[PDB]
């Protein structure tokens, strides 16, 4: 309960998609592989391309907004260090280096009495 987004929600739902949603991937900035990660710019541009922002800014904030909602999180390399999740703030760069991933802390259904998928 208690939904503090209203809009971001419609944004997350989109991101949750791969078609019209975002599209993370390993870039390998400086080490690690980073599976399921999208460049900061990828998001910004996305948000914009999604018509959720007018300029990188609106996107930068929209991005930082998702992270707060617990939808995304900062990864290694750019966009890191003094990461604070207290106030809205605008802790988020709009470049290629900067990376971000989806926060596992959110509404994520799970096999609980229902037709489950197969495994490999």
Curated annotation (Swiss-Prot):
Expression sites by tissue: Ubiquitous. Most abundant in the thymus, large bowel, small bowel, stomach, and prostate.
Source species taxonomy: Eukaryota, Metazoa, Chordata, Craniata, Vertebrata
Positions of transmembrane segments: none
Stated name of the protein: Pleckstrin-2
Coiled-coil portions: none
Role according to the record: May help orchestrate cytoskeletal arrangement. Contribute to lamellipodia formation. Overexpression of pleckstrin 2 causes large lamellipodia and peripheral ruffle formation.
The DEP domain, residue ranges: 18-104
Full protein: residues contained: 129 to 235 of 353
Species name: Mus musculus
Localization per record: Cell projection, Lamellipodium membrane; Cytoplasm, Cytoskeleton
């Amino acid at each position: 309960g208690s939904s503090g987004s209203s809009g971001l929600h419609r944004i997350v739902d989109k991101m949750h998609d791969t078609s019209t949603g975002i599209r993370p991937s390993p870039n390998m900035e400086q080490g690690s592989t980073y599976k399921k990660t999208f460049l900061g710019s990828s998001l910004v541009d996305w948000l914009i391309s999604s018509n959720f922002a007018a300029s990188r800014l609106e996107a930068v904030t929209l991005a930082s907004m998702l992270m707060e909602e617990n939808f995304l999180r900062p990864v290694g390399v750019r966009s890191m260090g003094a990461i604070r999740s207290g106030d809205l703030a605008e802790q988020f760069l709009d470049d290629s280096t900067a990376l971000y991933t989806f926060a596992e802390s959110y509404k994520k259904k799970v096999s609980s009495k229902e037709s489950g998928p197969s495994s490999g």
